[PDB]
Scaffold this motif. Structure first.
Motif, short mmCIF file in Angstrom:
data_model
loop_
_atom_site.label_atom_id
_atom_site.label_comp_id
_atom_site.label_asym_id
_atom_site.label_seq_id
_atom_site.Cartn_x
_atom_site.Cartn_y
_atom_site.Cartn_z
N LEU A 222 25.61 37.58 34.94
CA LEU A 222 24.64 37.59 33.96
C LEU A 222 24.11 36.06 33.69
CD1 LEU A 222 26.37 39.65 31.10
CD2 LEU A 222 24.87 40.37 33.18
N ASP A 223 24.82 35.01 33.58
CA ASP A 223 24.50 33.61 33.48
C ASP A 223 25.55 32.90 33.92
OD1 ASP A 223 22.77 31.99 31.74
OD2 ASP A 223 24.55 31.49 30.63
N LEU B 184 34.24 35.21 30.07
CA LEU B 184 34.11 34.23 30.87
C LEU B 184 35.10 34.16 31.87
CD1 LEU B 184 33.72 31.21 28.04
CD2 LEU B 184 31.77 32.63 29.13
N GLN C 143 36.01 38.46 22.72
CA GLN C 143 34.93 38.49 23.77
C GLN C 143 35.01 39.90 24.38
OE1 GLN C 143 36.61 34.95 26.22
NE2 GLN C 143 34.45 33.77 25.52
N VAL D 263 29.54 34.32 33.18
CA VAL D 263 29.55 35.45 32.11
C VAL D 263 29.24 36.55 33.08
CG1 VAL D 263 28.61 36.15 30.00
CG2 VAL D 263 28.45 33.68 30.53
N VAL D 264 29.73 37.79 32.60
CA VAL D 264 29.82 38.75 33.37
C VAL D 264 29.84 40.03 32.11
CG1 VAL D 264 31.18 38.35 35.28
CG2 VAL D 264 32.22 39.11 33.07
N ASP D 265 29.57 41.25 32.75
CA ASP D 265 29.09 42.46 31.76
C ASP D 265 30.32 42.81 31.06
OD1 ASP D 265 27.12 44.36 31.42
OD2 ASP D 265 28.58 45.75 32.13
N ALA D 266 31.49 42.71 31.66
CA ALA D 266 32.86 42.97 31.08
C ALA D 266 33.21 44.56 30.67
CB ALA D 266 32.96 42.18 29.71
N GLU E 114 33.05 42.12 22.16
CA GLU E 114 31.75 42.15 22.18
C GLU E 114 30.99 42.52 23.42
OE1 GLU E 114 31.91 37.72 21.44
OE2 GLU E 114 30.39 38.13 19.75
N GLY E 115 31.81 42.42 24.60
CA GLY E 115 31.18 43.00 25.88
C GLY E 115 30.78 41.65 26.68
N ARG E 116 31.45 40.65 26.58
CA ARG E 116 30.82 39.61 27.51
C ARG E 116 32.33 38.78 27.43
NH1 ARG E 116 28.85 35.95 24.33
NH2 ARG E 116 28.53 37.10 22.37
#
Lengths: 71, 175, 258
Positions: free
Chosen positions: B78-79, B145, B138, B102-105, B141-143
């Motif tokens: 994602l970022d 690292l 984290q 950062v990933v979809d999770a 939330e659905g994000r």
RNA sequence: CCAGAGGGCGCCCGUGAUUUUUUACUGUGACUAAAAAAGUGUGACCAAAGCAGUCAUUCGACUUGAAUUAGAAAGCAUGGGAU
RNA sequence: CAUCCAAAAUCGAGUAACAAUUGGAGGACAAGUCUGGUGCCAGCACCCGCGGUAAUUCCAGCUCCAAAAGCGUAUAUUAAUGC
RNA sequence: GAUCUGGUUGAUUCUGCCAGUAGUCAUAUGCUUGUUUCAAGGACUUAGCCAUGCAUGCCUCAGAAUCACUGCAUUGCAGGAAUCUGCGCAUGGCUCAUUACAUCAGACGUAAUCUGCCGCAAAAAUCUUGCGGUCUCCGCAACAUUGGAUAACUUGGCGAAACGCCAAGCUAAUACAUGAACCAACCGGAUGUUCUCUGUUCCGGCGGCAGGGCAACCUGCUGCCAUGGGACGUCCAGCGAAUGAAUGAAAGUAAAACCAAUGCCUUCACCGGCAGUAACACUCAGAAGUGUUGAUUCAAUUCAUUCCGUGCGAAAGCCGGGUUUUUUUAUCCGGCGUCUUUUGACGAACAACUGCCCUAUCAGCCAGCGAUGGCCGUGUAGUGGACUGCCAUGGCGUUGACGGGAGCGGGGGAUUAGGGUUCGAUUCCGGAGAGGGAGCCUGAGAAAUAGCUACCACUUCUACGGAGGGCAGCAGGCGCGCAAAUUGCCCAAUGU
């Protein structure tokens, strides 16, 4: 080889000294290789100490050696 | 062309090498591949081994792994939050090894709920297991690292491992 | 990639001359190394004398009338190193190449059931896929499923009639052993001791019969048998004993008076 | 298909040294292309040369010969222990 | 190159014209007490020195010497050099 | 052969050079030679320029023939053009210009990597083909029965010429593109709202219903499950590659329960008790409890996600030997050829230990733009300031750095009693180069030059619109200098 200087971070400077022979004059001469080495952060030998060094893959431009042991 | 050699460089004595030889094709740089985000595009190049290596351009997906439980699932990149090498890189969201990202999770969440015959397996796995707190917040939330632990510029696949407590706590504080 | 060889830069264990020709054959790669091998054409022409010329060696081999390892060959150039059985069935003769004393290639003549025997030294062992163990040899042969007692630098008796491996022989202890390379070639003796120097070549000290000890590298050891009365294969013309320079000259004269 | 006894070698690893220990030199041994040189054999008619050939006497023999030495430092192993 | 001038049958030296030359003869350095010509000219001479009408050294002839199917000359390099 | 002979003086003894003297595969040059045997030979002076010709191509029994090509044959056979395909052409050969921590020689490492041909070997993923009905769906059958173009050629041609080219129509494969069910072993994990034994209890969980509720929650009742194995169904599973995780033993004495699981012995029991013991709640009572190394994050195994064409056809391949008459047949066998994986060999590419001519009237050299090192990445087949970014301030030097001059390096040549002195352009080995430079493709390997692209110095053709050339390959020509061979014959030999 001994320790020529302790300068640089995780890199020391070793000085080997040996004797070459010349046939015509039948007499020896002193010649030294000033070489660079990567000293492990385990060791930190003082100037004048003697070091043992092995043969490893290249690690910088000049550095090919590593410090096995210290006397 | 581009070459990798000590024979255009100064010696330890400050002197200069002198040539007598035209450059080999054995020694041979090539221009760096730029992996970013966006639609996947892969341009091969032929190499000296008689095989191809793949130049990742614009990879927006990676195969990510969760430490300790010996698993992994795909998810979307994602970022890029951070990098050691430069700030400039991070802003363009280039992907090169040891960038934090950062990933979809989403799949990890899904998995962990599955971590009558079924039902008692769960209770056994719930037992003798725990998770770091900074992780779970984290992951709720659905994000998340993560770090990209494969080099994408010469394989055109971006694989990464997910940060765990010791190391996570460092990269967090750098932000 | 080299595809030419000059007579001088070629071995003179092939016994080429300085004059006559300029080139020597560079063999195709195979079981054996460039220095330790001897190419087909050299054998047939200069030794056996079934050919007087290069072209005649093509005539025989391309057609096929010649086998090595019991397999027929249509190859003009092929290596023949050490412990290789070659058979020309037209003559009905079976040669086993070896290292003769004094650095010479031996061509020794064997009973027919010995020519199905072969000895290969092991170099590495390793596990390959499926957990299938492999011994890789000095002739590049792959022995699938070797014994669990196999080690580097041991010999494996190898049936050429049908391919498998019967009981091994180790380099352990005093055993009848012969040298390969190093200019102690073809000299046979017991292992007296095996010195170790780790990170460097491991010296071994051999003692041949009628004393006169000496030293050669571990790498150059090739086992023969358990004992000298348990040998599986024949010895060359001399038994593996060298003699002094004086005695060479003496005997040369004595025979020349006939 | 020996209880016990101290063990005796071989193999691998762990632990222990008041300060282990090295090198030049030398002897011996390893490891090191050919051509060239020194050299052994041999009547290419001799000779520079070559690695050939020679013999019975035939439907081959010699287990045919093509030895061996040196070749700076530097590197290798192991004795010696004066300088 | 070799083998041959018939095996029945095949060539050929007597000034052995099938004729050896290149540098030297004062010293160093092996070989002229020569004869003609030239006369400090012409020239010789690595060096020392020869030539001014009495030349052992020049220019010719004869004689003898060294090497020999090879012998002079130039330059470089090595020995000579413990320069 | 371990050699001192002339020259300074009126005469003498020294110092000291000069001259004499012998070699040189060391070159030139003068003069002279009747034969044989053995040979160097345009290196030196310009790695200067080149007329002309030639110098790597190749097929059997085994990849493709309808030449409108030739014979034998009469819808049958053998030769067989040049053309597609495969392999090689990067090796040999020739030349020394650059060049001093370079290159090379001896010794050494690549656990830091690539590798066609050759050798020994390995290979169980794959839902396909045909027919009938029929909806793109089913049912059967199973040497698998696969598809589409392109050259030579034919036809029209173009251009001054050009190892310059165009359109249309053809038709091949071991070229190219597809694709193999059954055959099929062995090895596991995820499991399922499948039912069969089960735990003669309650500390926990889940579902449903009723009551109260601050909607957070509590109480009561019923059903199911709790250290278990069977039966049945479903999904993933191979090799190669990527990532994470586990594995890839160990060697610091012998008391005897204290807690749960569980086995064996034992009784009748769920009582007692520890004699037996690789592993072993299944079909295997031994079908890996154990990879090689001085050293490994390596080999290999397991588990979880992957790979998207840039990986993996049994060549959907060819040619023979027969049996066996009916040949023309699933009757069998042989020899070749190829994909991928694996590791020896032949080599490629890096690195380092030691050694190397003269010069100080060359003493300081190196960092903006990498100098020395650390840290993270990038790149490469790979290690590395090889390169980017960040950080540190180092590195080398009278034991001669740095700069300049001369020179390809070594094996070796000449000369010397010995010690030495001097040479090496040149047959062998190593490196580099192909007019001067740079860039590139293809290939396992090239920064190739009788391959390509560009510029520069030259240079050749052209009805001037354009098109080419690279001898330091063999002869040969011009130039050069003191100086150096035939535009010959042959693949018989030696190799490729």
């Amino acid at each position: 080889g001994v320790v020529h200087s302790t300068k640089m971070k995780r890199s020391i400077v070793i000085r080997r000294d040996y004797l070459h022979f010349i046939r015509k004059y039948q007499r020896y001469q002193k010649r030294h290789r000033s070489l660079t080495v990567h000293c492990s952060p385990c060791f930190d030998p003082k100037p004048g100490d003697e070091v043992i060094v092995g043969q490893c893959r290249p690690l910088s431009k000049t550095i090919r050696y590593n410090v096995l042991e210290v006397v | 062309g581009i070459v990798r050699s000590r024979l255009h460089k100064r010696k330890i004595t400050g002197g200069k090498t002198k040539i007598h030889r035209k450059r080999m094709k054995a020694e041979l740089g090539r221009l760096p591949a730029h992996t970013k985000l966006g639609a996947r595009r892969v341009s091969p190049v032929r190499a000296r081994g008689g095989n191809f290596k793949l130049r990742g351009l614009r990879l927006d997906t990676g195969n990510f792994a969760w430490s300790t439980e010996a698993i992994a699932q795909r998810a979307r990149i994602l970022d890029v939050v951070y990098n050691a090498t430069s700030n400039e890189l991070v802003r363009t969201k280039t992907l090169v090894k040891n960038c934090i990202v950062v990933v979809d999770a989403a799949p990890f969440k899904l998995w962990y709920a599955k971590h009558d015959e079924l039902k008692r397996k769960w209770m056994l796995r719930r037992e003798n297991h725990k998770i770091e707190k900074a992780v779970a917040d984290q992951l709720k939330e659905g994000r998340l690292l993560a770090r990209i632990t494969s080099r994408p510029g010469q394989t055109a696949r971006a694989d990464g491992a997910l940060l765990e407590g010791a190391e996570l706590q460092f990269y967090l504080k750098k932000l | 990639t080299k595809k030419h060889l000059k007579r001088l830069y070629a071995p003179k264990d092939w016994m080429l001359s300085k004059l006559t020709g300029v080139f020597a054959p560079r063999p195709r790669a195979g079981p054996h190394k460039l220095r330790e091998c001897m190419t087909l054409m050299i054998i047939i022409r200069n030794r056996l004398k079934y050919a007087l010329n290069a072209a005649e060696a093509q005539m025989i081999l391309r057609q096929g009338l010649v086998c090595v390892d019991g397999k027929p060959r249509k190859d003009t150039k092929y290596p023949v190193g050490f412990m290789d059985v070659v058979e020309i069935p037209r003559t009905g003769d079976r040669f086993r190449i070896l290292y003769d004393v004094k650095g010479r290639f031996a061509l020794v003549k064997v009973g027919e059931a010995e020519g199905n025997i072969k000895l290969l030294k092991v170099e590495n062992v390793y596990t390959s896929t499926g957990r299938i163990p492999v011994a890789m040899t000095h002739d590049g042969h792959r022995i699938r499923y070797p014994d669990p007692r196999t080690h580097r630098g041991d010999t494996l008796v190898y049936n050429l009639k049908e391919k498998k491996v019967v009981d091994l022989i180790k380099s352990s202890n005093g055993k009848v052993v012969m040298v390969t390379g190093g200019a102690n070639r073809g000299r046979i003796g017991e292992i007296m001791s095996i010195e170790r120097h780790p990170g460097a070549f491991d010296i071994a000290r051999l003692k041949d019969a009628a004393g006169h000890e000496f030293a050669t590298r571990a790498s150059n050891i090739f086992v023969i048998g358990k004992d000298m009365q348990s040998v599986p294969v024949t010895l060359p013309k001399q038994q593996g004993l060298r003699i002094n320079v004086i005695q060479e000259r003496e005997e040369k004269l004595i025979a020349a008076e006939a």
